[PDB]
């Protein structure tokens, strides 16, 4: 928000206005990433980012300490490396790189649509990296009617999300990918779970209002009530949601899951790639941004 709008205080006492990512401006597959360029706490255009910028971006803007990025930084710059050919140093090229399928980025996310999801032919591709209002409202129907999920919630969100792009992906296509994607869930619980109740570290509950929010406007809800958490949200959180998630019960079982959908995952570990291996061609679609309503400065 704007620097005298006080609306970050006592949380955040230096935020910046929203500013809409232009057609020419980088964004990513990650809300998160994507909600900080439109900040400017990162580079707006989302090019040329060091680590201790993003480690700086998202311990004082977002509650988020250094060590919940350790590994997400280290995988970053492992595919910067693997799609533009050579060591990006402490400079990632820029943000829509992490939509390179099958590496970082993942099948059955909540928000955004496969890789080839939905294709007539085994050469298309689409869009991997946008926030899809579609998708989305796929995970948000699991919890329709609500205003608080659990760990069980999430679980189940994650499996409707690996039944539908398993479904619906071009044959030979869906890979699933649980370490990644819950470390993501996790990330949902450590920024929107509703610390203004008094057991959330025990028992986080995610704020849907807030998760649509930030997902939907990539921008943070402080006009929902919303702020950074404090003391910053630390990588043993992250990983304890992580595992509680997949720990949860199935009471609902979509089907066409793929094998070993349901029970626990293995930890997320470095990426790595052949240097033989070509990487596959990025979408190349304009970045998102919200248009219903489209947002101001303090949004
Ligand atoms: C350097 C730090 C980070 C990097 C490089 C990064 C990178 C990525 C990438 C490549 C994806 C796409 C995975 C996919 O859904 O296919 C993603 C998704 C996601 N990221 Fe980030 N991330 C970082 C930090 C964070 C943090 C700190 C949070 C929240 C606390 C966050 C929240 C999310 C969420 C919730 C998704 C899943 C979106 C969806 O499935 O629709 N990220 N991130
Ligand atoms: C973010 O950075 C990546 C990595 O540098 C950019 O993707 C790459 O963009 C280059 C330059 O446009 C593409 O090279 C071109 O390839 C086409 C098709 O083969 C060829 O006709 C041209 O001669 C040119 O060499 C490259 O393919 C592409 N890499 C991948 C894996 O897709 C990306 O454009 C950047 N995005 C933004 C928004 O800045
Ligand atoms: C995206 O952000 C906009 C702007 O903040 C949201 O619309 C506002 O919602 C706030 C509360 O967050 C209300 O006080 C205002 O009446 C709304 N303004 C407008 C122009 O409608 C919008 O709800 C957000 N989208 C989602 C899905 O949360
Ligand atoms: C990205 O641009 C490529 C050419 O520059 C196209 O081959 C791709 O299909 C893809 O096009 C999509 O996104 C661009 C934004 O750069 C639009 O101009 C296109 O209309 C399309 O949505
Ligand atoms: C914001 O400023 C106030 C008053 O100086 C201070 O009490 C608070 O600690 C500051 N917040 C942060 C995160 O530094
Ligand atoms: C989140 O973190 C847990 C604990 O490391 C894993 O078990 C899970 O697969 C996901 O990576
Ligand atoms: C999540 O899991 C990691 C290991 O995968 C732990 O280091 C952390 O304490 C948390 O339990
Ligand atoms: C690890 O940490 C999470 C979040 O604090 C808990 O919900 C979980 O029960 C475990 O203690
Ligand atoms: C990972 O951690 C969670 C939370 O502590 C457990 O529920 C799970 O059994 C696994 O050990
Ligand atoms: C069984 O219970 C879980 C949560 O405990 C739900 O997510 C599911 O929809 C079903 O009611
Ligand atoms: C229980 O819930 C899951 C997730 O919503 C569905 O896949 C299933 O059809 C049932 O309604
Ligand atoms: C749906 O079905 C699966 C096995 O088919 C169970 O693991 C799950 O708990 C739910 O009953
Ligand atoms: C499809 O398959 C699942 C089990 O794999 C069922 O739970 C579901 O009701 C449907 O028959
Ligand atoms: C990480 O591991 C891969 C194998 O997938 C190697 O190809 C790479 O060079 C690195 O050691
Ligand atoms: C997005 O742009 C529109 C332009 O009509 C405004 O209505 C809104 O305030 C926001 O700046
Ligand atoms: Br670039
Ligand atoms: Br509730
Ligand atoms: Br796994
Ligand atoms: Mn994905």
Known sequence: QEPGSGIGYPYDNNTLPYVAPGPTDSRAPC?????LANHGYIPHDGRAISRETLQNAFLNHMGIANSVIELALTNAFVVCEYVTGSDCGDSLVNLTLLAEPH???????????????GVANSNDFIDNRNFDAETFQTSLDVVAGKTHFDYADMNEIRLQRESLSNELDFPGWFTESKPIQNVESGFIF????????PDNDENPL????????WFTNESFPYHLGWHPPSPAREIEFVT?????VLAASVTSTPSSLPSGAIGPGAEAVPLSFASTMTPFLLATNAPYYAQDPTLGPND
């Open 103 to 117: 590496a970082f980025e993942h099948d059955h996310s909540f928000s955004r649509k496969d890789y080839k999801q």
């Open 206 to 213: 995610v704020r849907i209002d807030w998760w649509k929010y």
């Open 31 to 35: 809300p998160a990433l994507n909600a």
């Open 190 to 197: 450590a920024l929107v779970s509703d610390f203004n109740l």
């Open 240 to 244: 304890s949601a992580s595992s509680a």
